[PDB]
């Protein structure tokens, strides 16, 4: 084969070769409306899809809850005080005690699912601030102990719907007798050790209180595996960090609440058995 | 209209007018086999079917669990001693703490479902007995108090998977201070007040230990309503009564166990909301 | 919403069919039918309570 600028393959094995404001969306029995939402982000431009047999690893017939699990669950609300650094919720670990989705993911061994995350935070025309919502895939976070690595515990690494928080400054877990085994992600490093500024490479939106009060993210199912355990592996992760601090009428104690509404989409399960009863506290 | 042996209708309203051994069946991830089962009874000759829109009362999109709920759940086992009169399990009240079917029926307001009941009881060629399994529709049972009627409580009328038992002789609940509000169905009267002999009008099978050791009943969804609450109304009811007492080698203490395996079929639900948490004990 | 033009917010209007504990917190209401009403510009919101009933009719 004479290629343009003589390529002959001598080895059978291949490895040996050479080198917009208005929005209303309905999922099941749940409906979401937002008159000042600045469009949606289809993360990586891929809508969630059911597993296709062409790339199907397991054989067992999949149980798709459909309406009973592809609903919008509103996680708890969090106050965005002036001196707040951020929050992070891992998925689907957040939807583990939410309706029938939690039951299905605990009962079934393997499970895949996309998500639709709607972050809601509204302020008056006289408020001043801006949030950034990033859907970090495979979101890891740094530990708190400099004497050990990858030492975080299951209970502390999976807060649930309560979520987690970013700390302004790192603080080693100096306790050498009973280490807390707890995440200590620095806000500007984003926890992973990278920089916040570059974090925009991830699928993201910005809730700028002057322009929009909502942020919609359609997160597909990204994973090295077509289907994987939901109780072990947390595919995505939502991180909400305030790019610019809240401010209002020269008032030093302004608070506004931020809410999340997550809807599993095209969620499929396999491998039914006794129900997982994990230790979380 | 001159009809054969002058019929004229004078009133607009219509009311004013004049007048075999081998069996193996798979549901979801569950499989049942029986080499000496004497065929199956499709109660009333109607296979369970999903609700058809032509006769659909509610509008809400129905959640059909399909594989996750149309499985074979094996209820507890019961010893068929010589001096045992019978047992009765109400459905779907039996499958209220069985896998995801219980969760779906508690979460959803309305729910319909057929069933496949497999009664299993095996004995040696030297055993002697015969059971009768009747799928009583709308199975009511008589109360224990002669001073009041329809006084049974929800907790006592819905034993769950434990089931109930038939008593040999009636015994009034003479306690007038705190009535037990408990069923007291006489065995030969079948509880309803009818006779046992006629009970064969209901869909039924007989487990005759000489011939067969299993009984399969495919119960459709019979109800005055297309779909109805599952936590209030118990559509069917299984009653197992020993037609001929157990006997074995002149031994006065022969026991054999009887097991039930119930599989919801074509189960559909509507009306999702907060989860019912009923008082049962 | 008969309020001022600068009053912005959101509400949850929920319909929960019968047969369970009546909703008393937003935690339980969302599980039923619900609509999120934005009070930004339009002053009105419609919740179509569907026909969920075991019987074909209901007594008055």
């Amino acid at each position: 084969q004479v290629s343009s600028q003589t390529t002959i393959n001598y080895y059978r094995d291949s490895a040996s070769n050479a080198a917009d404001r208005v929005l209303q969306l309905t999922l099941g029995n749940s409906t979401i409306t937002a008159q000042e939402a600045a469009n949606s982000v289809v993360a990586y431009g891929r809508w969630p899809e059911y597993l296709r047999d062409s790339e199907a690893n397991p054989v067992d017939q999949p149980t798709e809850p459909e309406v009973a699990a592809c609903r919008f669950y509103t996680l708890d609300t969090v106050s965005w005080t002036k001196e707040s650094r951020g929050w992070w919720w891992k998925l689907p670990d957040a939807l583990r005690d939410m309706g029938l989705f939690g039951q299905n993911m605990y009962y079934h061994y393997l499970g895949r699912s996309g998500y639709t995350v709607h972050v809601q935070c509204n302020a008056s025309k006289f408020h001043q601030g801006a949030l950034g919502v990033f859907a970090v895939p495979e979101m890891c976070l740094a530990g708190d102990s400099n004497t050990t690595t990858m030492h975080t515990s299951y209970q502390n690494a999976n807060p649930g719907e309560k979520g987690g928080t970013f700390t302004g400054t790192f603080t080693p877990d100096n306790n050498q007798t009973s280490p807390a085994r707890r995440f200590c992600p620095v806000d500007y490093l984003l926890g992973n050790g990278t920089l916040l500024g570059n974090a925009f490479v991830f699928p993201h939106q910005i809730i700028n209180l002057r322009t929009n009060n909502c942020a919609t993210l359609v997160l597909p199912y990204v994973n090295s595996l077509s289907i994987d355990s939901m109780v072990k592996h947390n595919n995505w992760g939502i991180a909400i960090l305030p790019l610019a601090p809240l401010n209002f009428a020269s008032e030093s104690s302004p608070e506004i609440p931020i809410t999340l509404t997550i809807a599993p989409m095209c969620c499929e399960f396999n491998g039914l058995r006794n129900i997982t009863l994990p230790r979380l506290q | 209209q001159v009809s054969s042996q002058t019929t004229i209708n004078y009133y607009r309203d219509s009311a004013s007018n004049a007048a075999d051994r081998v069996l193996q069946l798979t549901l979801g991830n569950s499989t049942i086999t029986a080499q000496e089962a004497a065929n199956s009874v499709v109660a009333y000759g109607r296979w369970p079917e999903y609700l058809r829109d032509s006769e659909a009362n509610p509008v809400d999109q129905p959640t059909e669990p399909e594989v996750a709920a149309c499985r074979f759940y094996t209820l507890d086992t019961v010893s068929w001693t010589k001096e045992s009169r019978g047992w009765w399990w109400k459905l779907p009240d039996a499958l209220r703490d069985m896998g995801l079917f219980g969760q779906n029926m508690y979460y959803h307001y309305l729910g319909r479902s057929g069933y496949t009941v497999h009664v299993q009881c095996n004995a040696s060629k030297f055993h002697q007995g015969a059971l009768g399994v009747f799928a009583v529709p709308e199975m009511c049972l008589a109360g224990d108090s002669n001073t009041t009627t329809m006084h049974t409580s929800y907790q006592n009328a819905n034993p769950g998977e434990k089931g109930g038992t038939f008593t040999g002789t009636f015994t009034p609940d003479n306690n007038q201070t705190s009535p037990a509000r408990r069923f007291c169905p006489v065995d030969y009267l079948l509880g309803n007040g009818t006779l046992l002999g006629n009970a064969f009008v209901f869909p039924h099978q007989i487990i005759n230990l000489r011939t067969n050791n299993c009984a399969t009943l495919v119960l459709p969804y019979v109800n005055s309503l297309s779909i109805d609450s599952m936590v209030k109304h118990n559509n069917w009811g299984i009653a197992i009564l020993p037609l001929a007492p157990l006997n074995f080698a002149s031994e006065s203490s022969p026991e054999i166990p009887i097991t039930l395996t119930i599989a919801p079929m074509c189960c559909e639900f509507n009306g999702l909301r907060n989860i019912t948490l009923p008082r049962l004990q | 919403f008969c309020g001022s033009m600068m009053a912005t917010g959101k509400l949850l209007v929920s319909y929960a069919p019968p047969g369970a504990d009546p909703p008393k917190k937003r935690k339980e209401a969302m599980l039923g039918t619900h609509v999120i009403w934005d009070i930004g510009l339009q002053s009105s919101c419609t919740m179509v309570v569907p026909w969920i009933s075991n019987t074909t009719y209901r007594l008055t």
Partner: peptide, 27 residues
Amino acid sequence: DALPNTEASGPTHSKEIPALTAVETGA
């Protein structure tokens, strides 16, 4: 007369927002 049939529906993501209206008009 047979009242209107309750037609089927599914998930939607449009911006028509028929749910929100204005009662100020008399319609």
